[PDB]
Amino acid sequence: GHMGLSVQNNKFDEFGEWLLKESNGSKDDLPSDVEIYKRIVELEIADTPETLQVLGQVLFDDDIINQIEPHVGLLTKLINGDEEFEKALLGGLERFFGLEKPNLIPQIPKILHGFYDRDLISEEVLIKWGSKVSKKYVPKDVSKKVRKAAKPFVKWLQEAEEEEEEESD
């Protein structure tokens, strides 16, 4: 990557490198979301889904469950209701759990539930994601392990579907 499968640096790797360099080993020392969005705009990557793949890999650490809410404003703005941008964030999270913090893999159902509760990733995107494996972000066996751990939450969403169906008269 470091933010993807490729070996050489692309513009999204540069963005990620910058964020990591600025934060200097501590997510507390990350630039504010205001400054991050300003940087995204300068780098001409406010309209590219891969930005979310980068953010999913650099914004969080072992304290991720507590770091979702502070970044809601920034992530919603970039996602802009678009499914492909949601999938990119999930791709970044898949690299995060799979390659960086595999110790968090048992917490995946709770963590993704947190993205869901804050309208960051839709139920439809989560269920499709959780039902396949991919080599787009991580090796397929890593993908399998990550998405397998998400199955309790995926099932929850699947079973909750009927009761949430829009009803009238």
From TrEMBL:
Superkingdom classification of source: Eukaryota
Domain W2 per the UniProt entry, residue ranges: 8-167
Protein family according to the UniProt entry: Belongs to the eIF-2-beta/eIF-5 family.
Name of the protein in its database record: Translation initiation factor eIF5
UniProt organism field: Candida albicans (strain SC5314 / ATCC MYA-2876)
Higher taxonomy: Eukaryota, Fungi, Dikarya, Ascomycota, Saccharomycotina
